[PDB]
Nucleic acid binder design. Sequence first.
RNA 1: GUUUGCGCGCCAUGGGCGCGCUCUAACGGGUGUAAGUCCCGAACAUGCCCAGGUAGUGGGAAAUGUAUAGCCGAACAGCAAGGGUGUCUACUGUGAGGUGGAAUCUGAAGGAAGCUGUAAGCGAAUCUCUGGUCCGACGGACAGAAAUCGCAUAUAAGGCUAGGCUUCGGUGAUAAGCUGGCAAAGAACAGUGAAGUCUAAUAACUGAAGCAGAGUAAAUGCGGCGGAUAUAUGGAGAGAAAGAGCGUGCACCUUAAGCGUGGAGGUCUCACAGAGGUUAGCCUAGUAACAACGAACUGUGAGAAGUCAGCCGAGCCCAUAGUAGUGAAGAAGUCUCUGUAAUGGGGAUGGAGCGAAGGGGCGAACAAUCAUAAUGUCUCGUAUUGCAGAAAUGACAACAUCUGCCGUAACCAAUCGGGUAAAAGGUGGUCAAAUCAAGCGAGACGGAAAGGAGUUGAUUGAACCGCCGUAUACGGAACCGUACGUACGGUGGUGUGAGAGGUCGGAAUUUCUCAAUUAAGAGAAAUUCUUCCUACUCGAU
Length: 387
Amino acid sequence: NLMEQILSSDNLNRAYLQVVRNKGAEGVDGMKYTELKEHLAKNGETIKGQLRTRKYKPQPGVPTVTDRFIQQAIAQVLTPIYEEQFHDHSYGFRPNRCAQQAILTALNIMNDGNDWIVDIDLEKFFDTVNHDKLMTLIGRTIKDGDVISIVRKYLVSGGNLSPLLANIMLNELDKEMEKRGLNFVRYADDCIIMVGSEMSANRVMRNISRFIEEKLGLKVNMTKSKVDRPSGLKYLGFGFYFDPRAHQFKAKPHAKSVAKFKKRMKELTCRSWGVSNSYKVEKLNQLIRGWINYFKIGSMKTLCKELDSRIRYRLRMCIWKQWKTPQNQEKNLVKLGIDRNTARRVAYTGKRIAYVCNKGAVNVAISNKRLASFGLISMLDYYIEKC
RNA sequence: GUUUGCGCGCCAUGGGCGCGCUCUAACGGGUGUAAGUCCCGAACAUGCCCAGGUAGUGGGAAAUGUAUAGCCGAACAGCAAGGGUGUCUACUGUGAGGUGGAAUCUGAAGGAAGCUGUAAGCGAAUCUCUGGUCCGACGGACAGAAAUCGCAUAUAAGGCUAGGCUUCGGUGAUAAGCUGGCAAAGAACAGUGAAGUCUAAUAACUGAAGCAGAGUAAAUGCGGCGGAUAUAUGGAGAGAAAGAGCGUGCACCUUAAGCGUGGAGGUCUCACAGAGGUUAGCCUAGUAACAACGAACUGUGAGAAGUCAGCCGAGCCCAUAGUAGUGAAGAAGUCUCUGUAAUGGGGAUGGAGCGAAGGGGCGAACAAUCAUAAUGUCUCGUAUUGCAGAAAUGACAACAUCUGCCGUAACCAAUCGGGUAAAAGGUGGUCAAAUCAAGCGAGACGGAAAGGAGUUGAUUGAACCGCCGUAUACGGAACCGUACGUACGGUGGUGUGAGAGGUCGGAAUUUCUCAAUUAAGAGAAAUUCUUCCUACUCGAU
Ligand SMILES: [Mg+2]
Ligand SMILES: [Mg+2]
Ligand SMILES: [Mg+2]
Ligand SMILES: [Mg+2]
Ligand SMILES: [Mg+2]
Ligand SMILES: [Mg+2]
Ligand SMILES: [Mg+2]
Ligand SMILES: [Mg+2]
Ligand SMILES: [Mg+2]
Ligand SMILES: [Mg+2]
Ligand SMILES: [Mg+2]
Ligand SMILES: [Mg+2]
Ligand SMILES: [Mg+2]
Ligand SMILES: [N+]
């Protein structure tokens, strides 16, 4: 009787609105989402009748758009009550639960202080999930067989049902962990399992690997699942370092994240690019606001300030490259506020001279007040304003 | 749309080939028939070293200058004919315009074959060895192409820039080159420096190799192989060898800003003749051109400024023009040798031709895009088959599970020797199934319709980045350039920059009309896009 809760007008138009805010790729059908609106406006009774009578035949590298609308409706009807069923320490794919408070909870329980962290990974998770056991757990939760029927025929056949199915299969494991009394966090697929003793770390490793391999039907790789120290194993782009005050085990962005940050930065502000530097300033601003809104809790202030110095040196180097003509280089430099002959010698020197750019009168030619007049915000200020 | 950039002609102050004299190693001597060629000698000044934080004397090792006849002139200065101004001004014309000046800018990398004077540099047949460099196209180095070989090469080789760290911390001089954190190349300065050769002398006083990174790219790097090498490339050895200036000759050969001349096509001005409307009187423009508003259009005649940028483009068309030119020192054409990738070059006949400039058109071709007898399957039966739920009873109290301990160590933290399934230990019986069983299915079996594995039309190809070869020049030998330097022949890449004016064409949309003024339908003025045009204004080469 729950497909009779599915096929209700507010649920359908909310699912439709969510799919058109997704703006997903069309793919094999190649069918555009406003025409998805038109096609559902002409096929609503047909699709709803097929849902009632279970003769729907959905078909997939990119899913079909009407199938995406059906996914969104199924997820919208299935997340409530399940959220009460799901473990409260599982922070994936729900409203009001993200990875940042997952790392915050992890910080709380390493303030409790479990030593060796078991990074449990499950390679090819959708391959290891059995359809029958997942449907069995769904049938144990919801008794009406029509939704079980459509989810089953869909599973034999981004996606908005894969979060719920992953959360179901992981949440049974989370309930078993709470049955053990063990402490652990997981976002979506990656599990950090926290234990204070290396012998107990290997014991919990063996227990969990055997429990995953037989009862759940899933498989855990022996590559990622090493019982290692927190400084050597990362969780969602975050590394953990030791505050040398004994009470905290503090967080930082893992160096691969900052490597990606630096790489995208340097590939965005190449001074051989032909685009105006206001556009590059705005793109830089987009990346920094996203990067703070993700990595707020983990500290890299001693690293991000060196990166700030790199930011302003790179901007001054880019502006010097974009001026590109020695005569107007001299003219713009003397407009900047330096004397004529120093501008002359610097302008004839201006070919190459990366060394004069990183330190010299070139670095004084564009300063912090001038780049604040340009309008780009610093990383440190976006820290001190952020909660 | 980047000062110049077109055709034809003349002229070397350019080069070559013959001739003539004369000069040549500081100054001097030898040597030998013969020295410009081979040998020998002095002084001063500089570099380098004795300073040992210094620096004036005082001395020494290589090297260099004074010091070949002579060359060539800096990214050096001064001059400078010319060229520009969208800057002022005097004159001249009815007018398009012309001319002369003041204020400047330029006077360049391709002919005032610009002038004068410098710094630095150079500076002698040929042979041999060697270092360095450059080249053997372009194309991230494929394809294509006449156009080396093998690897490597972008989340980035390899070259650099500044630090951390492992190990060692008097000999020099010379001097092509290499690098100074990257498009490429050059100058200057700085720091190093290959092959060798020469030298390894004298008494003092007042930092280099290797390992990991962090940076740093408009891409090449490394190793052969062939070749080139007069910025007279760095040197080493043979070599009684040739170099330099000046004059001069040729039926010798060339030059983009010099000199003379030629300008189509298209734009503008003016006076005549025909239309036009203004009220026999006026005007015939303004808008960059196109379109449009418009009376504002057209054949004449008189002029004026004026060209000249490969990009798909053979050839035909217009006009200067079959003219300027060129051609009897000898044209077109024919015949016979010959080269290249292609363009080309001789020779013999032959006895009059041959034959320009810029701008628009049309346009073949080339290129791109677009047109041109199984499986299988839907529907019932038929019993299996995939996972869950309490478990009479049977077997076993042995399996799941959370908690990191030993000592030793002067106090363990292998922080010292064990052990990571080290110990002490909590919690929960653990299961094979009599038994039955929602829901979703998934397969498997028959009966049930059939079916089965070359060519041409059209549209676009705006503009650019180059590269190679012969010829011809310059900055700066190579390299990098000078519009790809330019001409001709070869050859790959990128693909439609802004603003403004149009075309407001086509569609959506604001407003109207139509389909009944009803569709998310169609159309008309115009908003956006799109299509197309425009150097008109900017930007790019
Ligand atoms: Mg070449
Ligand atoms: Mg080359
Ligand atoms: Mg190349
Ligand atoms: Mg490397
Ligand atoms: Mg020499
Ligand atoms: Mg004239
Ligand atoms: Mg073209
Ligand atoms: Mg063309
Ligand atoms: Mg030169
Ligand atoms: Mg070259
Ligand atoms: Mg070149
Ligand atoms: Mg070039
Ligand atoms: Mg160019
Ligand atoms: N030009």
